[PDB]
From a paper:
Type IV pili (T4Ps) are abundant in many bacterial and archaeal species, where they play important roles in both surface sensing and twitching motility, with implications for adhesion, biofilm formation and pathogenicity. Bacterial surface pili are assembled by repeated interactions of monomeric protein subunits called pilins, leading to the formation of a filamentous structure that protrudes from the cell and binds to surfaces. As P. aeruginosa T4Ps mediate surface sensing, the first step of biofilm formation, they play a key role in allowing P. aeruginosa to transition from a unicellular planktonic to a multicellular biofilm state. PilA subunits constituting the T4P exhibit a classical pilin fold featuring an extended N-terminal α-helix linked to a C-terminal globular β-sheet-containing domain, which are packed tightly along the pilus, in line with models derived from previous cryo-EM data of the P. aeruginosa PAK strain.
Numbering used by the authors:
A (entry chain A), B (entry chain D): 7 to 78
Amino acid sequence: FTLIELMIVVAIIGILAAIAIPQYQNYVARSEGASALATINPLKTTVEESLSRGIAGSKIKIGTTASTATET
Amino acid sequence: FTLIELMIVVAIIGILAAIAIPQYQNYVARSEGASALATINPLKTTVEESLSRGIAGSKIKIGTTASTATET
């Protein structure tokens, strides 16, 4: 092992560092907003259809309970 | 101290020298190229995403300034 060998390794370590890391939280925030909008968008169909069929607005709830003829 | 002692030391000094040093600037240049490419590669995502969302190309700049809805 020579000192030139180790100094070249140190220089290449420094060069391999310093790689600029761009902003990434904006991408995550935008994806979260898109996911939320895509999650709550189909619920417009449920509310509108239930209101069209006469189901009371107070009877339109959120859950996995089996919807009856009066509750959705 | 004997002259044979010192001559053996001189011979071993000469032998410990003469160690061939291979080329090393090629490694540094290749690492620098890889580091530069890895630095500017993620900027493709930023430009493409900003163009997809309608941000004007002239509004896509480089810096740590907080990107607004119109500038990136």
